[PDB]
Design a protein around this nucleic acid. Structure first.
Lengths: 127, 125, 60, 99, 79, 155
RNA sequence: CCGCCGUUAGUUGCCAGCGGUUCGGCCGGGCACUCUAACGGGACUGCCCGCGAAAGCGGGAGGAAGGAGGGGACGACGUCUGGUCAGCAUGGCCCUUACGGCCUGGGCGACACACGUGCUACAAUGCCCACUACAAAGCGAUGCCACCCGGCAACGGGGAGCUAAUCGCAAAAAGGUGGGCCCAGUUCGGAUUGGGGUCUGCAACCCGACCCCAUGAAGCCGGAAUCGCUAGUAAUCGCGGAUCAGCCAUGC
């Protein structure tokens, strides 16, 4: 009845609620196709739905927040993947080498005090 | 189909083609084109002499352009160089007015940089 | 001349636009973090030599 | 009906005290809404290491300021009494308000 | 450029108010090359300071009312 | 580099047709960050291109890719002083890679208005062999067999 | 620091489930969830297929995480007798009815030029308008400065809150929705030049930043060379902060 799911990615945390039903999603206040009318990673975030073809089995209400829209979206992906696992661990087993429960190592990392953008030094003169 | 100083833009959005012109930018443009009619969108190949004429009736019958704006500035400058205020001093000597940085820059008001001789670089290495 | 500069803005002279800070344990106003009134090098000597609560060699 | 604000430095020392609050207050007073933590506010600063004026050689330092918060219901005698007589910060500071 | 009311110098004020009341000399020296130009002096030879020495200049008409030191050169060598 | 033979690394499995070629192209067009601006340009493109002809996009696309696939290159070689131009048969990775990036070059030249038409025109012309980058590819092949001498003197 | 799990606590928040509901958590109500955080855990090539005298290399399972997890702080014995006494301390040497005190004024802002390092464009992967999303990080009751009245605004008048997860600085921007430009110095671009002003400050001459009426320069992507950089990195995108009255801050 209450298939809760968590999903974190890049300065954003997705409070993903999955309930049983239609496999249709209304995210944070706007429709899935309307909130996310810009990045096609939207439907890509629904990859777990398409992974078990459950884009019709289980409804969803979402509360993802933080970062930028993209990171939010991918985080939602992790969330959807994690909601079914809690209530059906037969599903995590078939979804591991698919890369669904392995995470990142990213942020716009701490600024350097010798270079502009960490990798960007002052250009070098020599003379 | 003319106005002043033999100026005709020909086939374009009116007010833009007008902003192309000396002494008047977008502000004055919209101002005139909103006090004396004419919608901005209309291209000029479909005009009529009436509003052309009365537009030119807001143009010169009010402020000043071309022949004056240059002459006025010129007079003011003749004043800046009448007692020789620091400003007019630097008007003569060939530099900007701000008095900021001319040590390496200042080539927007006095031609290309003609290298003296470098004055010979020491061992900076 | 160095003795004057410190006694100068010490006893309040005229307009607010002439109030330079001071590392009172060295004597300078330049890059003096006006939260303490301590210059760069000297804020560093005091902090280094441990005489400061809650001052941390950042590890973040 | 009691609110208390806590501003301390050293985490270990402060927390054991912030524990000593809610713990012993759960005795001398009734229910003590445990130390709902307030983000370690930090006064950030930067400096150099060498005096021979360069544009290199720099280190970052943080004034790490710990915040802790306490809420209490309807108070008692004993609370006031014993929890006004003792406190050993030897550092940390405590500032309270009964809104 | 001061919102309302302009900025000048009242030492020159005390000097000039009794200078106008007569129209005495041609010696209106000023070791204060700051104050904005104020026409209320009938324009006499402001023998102002030049950072280095007391260099003069006459004030006449067209100068509507603009600051002082820009007329005391103070900068040596020209280019 | 030295101790290392480096490694490979995955390409974003196209979220429309599920191929690596697609995203490699996408990433070429992807400028200054916004992957989806330029990607949108190429998908708009693919829709236009698949309107113009009677076959699917990956077909025309792959045919163009084959019209590239630069099988031989020319590097630099020491000879105690003089310079050699070593004509060597590539690893298909760089073949297809700079096939997509030189595709992108041909698109850089193309004087078309909106980008979609540039990319489109390019894929057509290329798929036939009338493409700029394809032409280029065979020209660099001419470079490869012009120094056929150097094909026996490599580094 | 950040990535997962857990114990530990909810005036941040939350209908996740109910209610009031001005269908804004706005309010009872809860604190499961978010976060915030005290403390721990958790992954070692432990294991599996294989090869190797080994080191260990290739695949696989497992799992939040792999086989240094993405980064730090740390910079040896000693060198370059580099350099800082003008940040300091300090020896030595020198000034003393002054190389010092006071101050007004100007000067480090000056200029025929070489160069570094930074910024902003030469457009159509791009600019202008409206429209509307999604960041973190911080400073702020000797301060941060909103909400209304004004105005083109800078900025000022009434001044509201905030000793501050509860109020504020504050508005992110790229984007993307609808339209307009049309490859032309091009509504590209903003230096320079004139005049109108407001703030700050005693006061913006030599010496300020900004709102505005006017020009709209040089430039249609760059010689010889030289430069950074292996991924959330180049690039792009905005900001807080700090010294600081304001302010040349594109710097850091």
């Amino acid at each position: 009845e209450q298939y809760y799911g968590t999903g974190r990615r890049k300065e954003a945390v997705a409070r993903v609620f999955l309930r049983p039903g239609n496999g249709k999603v209304t995210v944070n206040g706007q429709d899935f196709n309307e909130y996310f009318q810009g990045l096609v990673r939207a439907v890509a975030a629904l990859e777990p739905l398409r992974a078990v073809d459950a884009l019709g089995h289980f409804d969803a209400y979402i509360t993802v927040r933080g970062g930028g829209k993209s990171g939010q979206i991918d985080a939602i992906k992790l969330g959807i993947a994690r909601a079914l696992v809690q209530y059906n661990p037969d599903y995590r087993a078939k979804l591991k080498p698919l890369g669904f429960l392995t995470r990142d190592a990213r942020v716009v990392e701490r600024k350097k005090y010798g270079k502009h953008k960490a990798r960007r030094a002052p250009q070098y003169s020599k003379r | 189909a003319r106005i002043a100083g033999v100026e005709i833009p020909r086939n374009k959005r009116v007010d833009v083609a007008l902003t192309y012109i000396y002494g008047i930018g977008k502000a004055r443009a919209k101002e005139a084109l909103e006090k004396t009619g004419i919608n901005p969108a209309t291209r000029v190949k479909d005009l009529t002499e009436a509003e052309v004429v009365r537009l030119r009736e807001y143009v010169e019958n009010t402020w000043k352009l071309e022949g004056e704006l240059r002459a006025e500035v010129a007079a003011n400058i003749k004043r800046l160089m009448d007692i020789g205020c620091y400003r007019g001093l630097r008007h003569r000597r060939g530099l900007p007015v701000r008095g900021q940085r001319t040590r390496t820059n200042a080539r927007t008001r006095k031609g290309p940089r003609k290298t003296v001789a470098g004055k010979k670089k020491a061992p900076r290495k | 001349a160095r003795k004057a500069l410190i006694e100068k803005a010490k006893r309040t002279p005229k307009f607010k636009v002439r109030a330079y800070t001071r590392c009172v344990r060295c004597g300078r106003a330049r890059s003096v973090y006006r939260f303490f009134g301590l210059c760069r090098i000297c804020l560093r000597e005091l902090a280094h030599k441990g005489q400061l609560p809650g001052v941390r060699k950042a590890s973040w | 009906k009691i609110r208390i604000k806590l501003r301390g430095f050293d985490h270990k020392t402060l927390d054991a005290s912030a524990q000593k609050i809610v713990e012993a207050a759960r005795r001398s007073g009734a229910q003590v809404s445990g130390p709902i933590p307030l983000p370690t506010r930090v006064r950030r600063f930067t400096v150099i290491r060498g005096p021979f004026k360069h544009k290199d050689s720099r280190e970052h330092f943080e004034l790490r300021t710990h915040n802790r918060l306490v809420d209490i219901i309807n108070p008692n005698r004993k609370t006031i009494e014993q929890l006004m007589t003792l406190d050993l910060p030897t550092g940390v500071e405590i500032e309270i308000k009964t809104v | 450029s001061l919102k309302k009311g302009v900025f000048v110098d009242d030492h020159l004020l005390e000097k000039v108010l009794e200078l106008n009341a007569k129209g005495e000399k041609r010696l209106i020296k000023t070791w204060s090359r700051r104050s904005t130009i104020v026409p209320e002096m009938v324009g006499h030879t402001i023998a102002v300071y030049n950072g280095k020495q007391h260099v003069p200049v006459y004030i006449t008409e067209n100068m509507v009312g603009h600051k002082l030191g820009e007329f005391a050169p103070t900068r040596t060598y020209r280019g | 580099a030295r101790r290392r033979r480096a490694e490979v690394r995955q390409l974003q499995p196209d979220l429309v047709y599920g191929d690596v070629l697609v995203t490699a192209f996408i990433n070429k067009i992807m400028r200054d960050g916004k992957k989806n601006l330029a990607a949108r340009i190429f998908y708009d493109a693919c829709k236009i291109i698949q309107e113009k002809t009677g076959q699917e996009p990956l077909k025309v696309f792959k045919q163009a890719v084959e019209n590239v696939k630069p099988r031989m290159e020319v590097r630099s070689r020491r000879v105690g002083g003089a310079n050699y131009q070593v004509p060597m048969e590539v690893s298909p990775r760089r073949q297809q890679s700079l096939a997509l990036r030189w595709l992108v070059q041909a698109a850089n030249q193309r004087p078309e208005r909106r980008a979609a038409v540039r990319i489109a025109h390019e894929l057509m012309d290329a798929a036939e062999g009338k493409g700029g980058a394809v032409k280029k590819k065979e020209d660099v092949e001419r470079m490869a067999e012009a120094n056929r001498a150097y094909a026996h003197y490599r580094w």
